[PDB]
Amino acid sequence: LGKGFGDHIHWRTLEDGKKEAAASGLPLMVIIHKSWCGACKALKPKFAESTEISELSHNFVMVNLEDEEEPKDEDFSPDGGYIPRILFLDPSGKVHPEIINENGNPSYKYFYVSAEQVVQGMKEAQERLTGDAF
Template sequence: MLLTFNYNWFIGSFFIAIVTASSQNSGRGFGEQYNWFSLKEGLERARNNNKPLMLIIHKTWCGACKALKSQFSASKEIEVLSSHFVMVNAEDDEEPKDEQYFPDGGYVPRILFVEPAGKVRTEFFNEDGNLSYKYFYSNAESVATTMKRVKHSIKSGSRITEEL
């Protein structure tokens, strides 16, 4: 009886540890303060809430991704702006395969903005960056600048909402 109790306790504790670990890693270094979704869940939520989706595509082995993570997670400005977006980060094999998610290549990190209907909006890119890699961001300030452009576009009733 004692052996069964300990075994059940162990299994239960193991399950709780796995659930806790997975929820603690949902930000994957980009910040636990955000409400992160998978791409599938995010697209559904964006459509249902008429919000744009912000998609971060990154790899665990990528040095530039790691550098951006620390800035992104520490940015209070991005945190405030995130309430206007459905936040998705796709890591490693979660990178979507559809060609719309590769508007100018498959480099990482890549940040794309997707309208509620599911179309990547290629006009929202890092205007301070390299035009050969439009969706590459190396700092939080550039990310926040583009987020503001997307937010303003939605507020002013531009194409991002008109195409719904």
């Protein structure tokens, strides 16, 4: 179910994941990716091999959406249709586009290229989205 992002991580569908998030009070982390894309291919082993990403993932409903699993919902492309994109959602299921890859390029807010960048996004989302801190 991880599609290369790591089989030691619990992966949910978006629909099941939103149900779990609401019931557990967990934010969601949604990774949109395509099976042909070079950026997606490159990110996968970096994500899968990160102990810190795995430890942080317990605080989220983790969702990866491959190819046609991508939502037909503009909330999931706030600044463009590049891939992969990582978006964080509150437990009620709303996308929080203000949580971005701060160490990336400002034109590609949801484009993360290293495990270290992903970890920083997860840490911010955990703090901001859990318990409606925002």
